[PDB]
């Protein structure tokens, strides 16, 4: 029966029938009566549609428009699409089920069926199945019988005769094959097939080797688990387990904790990207907001205002460097500045000549040549990259002085915040006055000046690195401030020369040379300036209260490096403010929820309430809310400036010890399981970072003050 159907139909009809039955997931070789029925239905529908066009007026034509549109022999998605489009455009309501085709002269759906049985039986069956009163039904019969709704035959008598003849001849061929009697059509039963997913072959072999030691096959393990009942297994194996396995609670008393052990070694040295407390700035008066003027023009003007330049000479040499190169670098910067000065046109950027001194100071051609392993495996000294622990350093007293200086109040404002929407709600007005207090206190902090300097420097370095990665660019270090007299000032701290910046990885390093003005004699704390080469560049005639006093002016010159990630995080230093400010607000609000009124004005103006924030030879010092705000701001800024994995580890580990000490202070009877392990974890993070060492020393001070 399969070959007869396949060989007696247009390949297109049979192919459409196969695709249709496969869309249902059935097997063409298993079910064939359905295949024959659908193929006959396709043939009759195609004969129905074939040889029927529509002229311009809209009448019949026999051999342009097609009179009929076929729905059967298509994927459910496409059939549903066609019926939906027809119903939408024509206006005829679409049927719940899927018809066979659609006529357009009468604008209605027509259903075609081919059945050996009597026309009336199948007609009634399908009519009461579809339950549609606006769709034609046209049933044909193998014997030539045919009928439709109201006896209305849509197709011409000639076309109906052709359909009847084709059906009769295919029936005669079926009878000739002898399988005509045993066909009897086949109705869709909609059988359901159970899901199966077997483990065999290599997979079963792998499964048999993924079991506890005493099982040989997955089936045996499954049988064991399915019949498993709990019979004191946990209790028995707890009885067997050695008593050395325990979580013994060590009481945490006031005499338990000990000070952290700081590392021993040479004193730590400065490692910030710019000077913090030793910075000196040359200032000019100009009415410009943040980042308005040309930086090189401002730097030239600031340089002009200082008279008293001197022939530079080395005061404190860089031990591991070539100091004449630093001297030549400063001289070259001066010469290039003069060159731009005598130009009458100030470019947005200046490219420095690739001299030998700058080539060395910026690490030009310092990367080893990259070669294949087979070409160098025999090199005698070839070895793995040095991957040892960083050398340890001991805490020095300059970091505490830096922090003290960073916590101080300044006479100038260092930040000018942007506008926001007008206040309309009472809470907005309260927030506005509270924020006026906060902005006043935070704008006059030295840590804010550090924030501005860092943001500017990192932004300039990143922009230069991306824009010109093959040039040595001169970047002046500029900041803007407003003095207590309300007048704008532009300050120059020094200069930066960036090197090649072909930055691919986020940790790739761009080297730069920083030259910063200072009044600090490096010989007072040499260990702080190990990485620096310090020159003497002039004599500045300072104006003091009694009169005028001359002081030498030094230039701290060093080679430093930064990466894309470090630059990006330095560009976002302003968020530091938020941290401190948030902590301040929660402290005021907490105290305002018990007095039923806002205490911001009381806290900031009268300074009635104070918090312990400092240490003095006499004892613990208490500061006002503004002092606390500035101290927390300085801590956030120094976290940003001295970031390192040591700081992260120390913070994470010391948080637990702080919480345990707090539990002790709350009389909650704290206990520990391995306190020496926690101490070792904390102490392994203290290696050489001055900021982390200072934090550890602060923790020791707090520990000695909190348990007495």
């Amino acid at each position: 029966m399969e070959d007869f159907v396949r060989q007696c139909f247009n390949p297109m009809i049979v192919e459409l029938a196969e695709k249709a039955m496969k869309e249902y997931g059935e097997d063409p070789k298993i079910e064939t009566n359905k295949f024959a029925s659908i193929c006959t239905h396709l043939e009759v529908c195609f004969m129905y549609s074939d040889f029927h066009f529509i002229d311009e007026r809209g009448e019949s034509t026999i051999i342009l428009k097609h009179r009929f549109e076929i729905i059967e022999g298509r994927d459910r998605t496409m059939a549903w699409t066609v019926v939906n489009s027809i119903c939408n455009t024509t206006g005829v309501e679409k049927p719940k089920f899927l018809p066979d085709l659609y006529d357009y002269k009468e604008n209605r759906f027509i259903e075609i069926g081919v059945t050996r049985r009597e026309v009336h039986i199948y007609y009634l069956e399908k009519a009461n199945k579809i339950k549609s009163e606006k769709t034609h039904i046209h049933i044909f019969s193998f014997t030539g019988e045919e009928m439709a709704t109201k006896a209305d035959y849509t197709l011409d008598e000639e076309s109906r005769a052709r359909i009847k003849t084709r059906l009769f001849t295919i029936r005669q061929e079926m009878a000739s094959r002898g399988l005509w009697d045993s066909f009897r059509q086949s109705e869709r039963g909609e059988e359901t097939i159970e899901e199966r997913f077997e483990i065999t072959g290599t997979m079963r072999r792998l499964a048999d080797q993924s079991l506890p030691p005493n099982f040989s096959s997955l089936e045996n393990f499954r049988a064991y688990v399915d019949g498993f009942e709990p019979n004191g297994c946990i209790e028995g194996k707890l009885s067997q387990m050695s008593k050395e396995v325990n979580a013994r609670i060590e009481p945490f008393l006031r005499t338990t904790p000990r000070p952290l052990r700081l590392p021993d070694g040479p004193p730590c040295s400065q490692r910030s990207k710019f000077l913090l407390m030793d910075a000196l700035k040359l200032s000019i008066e100009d009415p410009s907001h943040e980042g308005e003027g040309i930086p090189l023009y401002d730097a030239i003007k600031c340089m002009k205002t200082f008279f008293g330049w001197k022939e530079p000479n080395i005061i404190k040499p860089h031990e591991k460097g070539i100091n004449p190169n630093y001297l030549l670098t400063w001289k070259q910067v001066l010469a290039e500045l003069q060159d731009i000065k005598n130009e009458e046109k100030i470019p947005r950027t200046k490219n420095m000549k690739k001299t030998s001194q700058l080539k060395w100071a910026l690490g030009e051609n310092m990367a080893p040549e990259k070669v294949d392993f087979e070409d160098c495996k025999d090199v005698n000294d070839l070895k793995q990259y040095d991957s040892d622990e960083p050398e340890p350093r001991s805490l020095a007293c300059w970091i505490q002085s830096e922090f003290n200086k960073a916590c101080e109040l300044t006479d100038s404002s260092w930040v000018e915040l942007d506008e926001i929407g007008e206040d309309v709600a009472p809470i907005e007005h309260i927030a506005s006055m509270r924020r006026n207090y906060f902005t006043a206190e935070v704008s006059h902090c030295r840590a804010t000046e550090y924030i501005m300097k860092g943001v500017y420097i990192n932004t300039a370095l990143l922009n230069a690195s991306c824009a010109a990665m093959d040039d040595f660019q001169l970047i002046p270090m500029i900041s803007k401030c407003i003095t207590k007299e309300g007048r704008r000032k532009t300050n120059l701290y020094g200069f930066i020369i960036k090197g090649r910046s072909h930055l691919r990885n986020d940790t790739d390093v761009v080297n730069f040379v920083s030259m910063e003005f200072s009044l600090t004699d490096p010989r007072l704390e040499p260990h702080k300036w190990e990485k620096y080469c310090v020159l003497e560049i002039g004599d500045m005639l300072l104006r003091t209260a009694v009169g005028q006093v001359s002081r030498p002016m030094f230039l701290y010159v060093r080679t430093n490096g930064t990466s894309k990630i470090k630059m990006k995080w330095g560009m976002e230093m302003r968020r530091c403010l938020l941290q401190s400010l948030q902590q301040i607000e929660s402290m005021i609000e907490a105290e305002s929820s018990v007095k039923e009124k806002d205490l911001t004005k009381e806290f900031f103006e009268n300074k009635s309430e104070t918090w312990p924030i400092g240490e003095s030879p006499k004892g613990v010092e208490e500061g006002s809310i503004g002092k606390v705000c500035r101290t927390l701001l300085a801590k956030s800024v120094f976290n940003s400036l001295y970031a390192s994995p040591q700081l992260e580890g120390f913070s994470a580990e010391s948080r637990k010890l702080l919480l345990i000490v707090q539990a002790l202070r709350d009389n909650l009877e704290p206990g520990t399981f391995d306190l020496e392990g926690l101490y070792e974890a904390i102490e392994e993070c203290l290696i050489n970072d001055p900021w982390v060492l200072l934090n550890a020393s602060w923790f020791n001070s707090f520990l000695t003050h909190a348990l007495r």
Binding site: M277, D278, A279, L280, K281, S283, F306, F307, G308, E408, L409, S412, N436, Y437, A440, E441, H444, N491, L519, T520, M540, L541, L542, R543, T544, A545, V546, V549, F604, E605, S624, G626, K627
Partner: peptide, 23 residues
């Protein structure tokens, strides 16, 4: 609001080493 601090010394900072006046 003008922030103030008790630690402010009117005389100890004879000149500011970071932002001094040099004519």
């Amino acid at each position: 609001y003008s922030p103030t601090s008790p630690s402010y010394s009117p005389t100890s900072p004879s000149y500011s080493p970071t932002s001094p006046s040099y004519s």
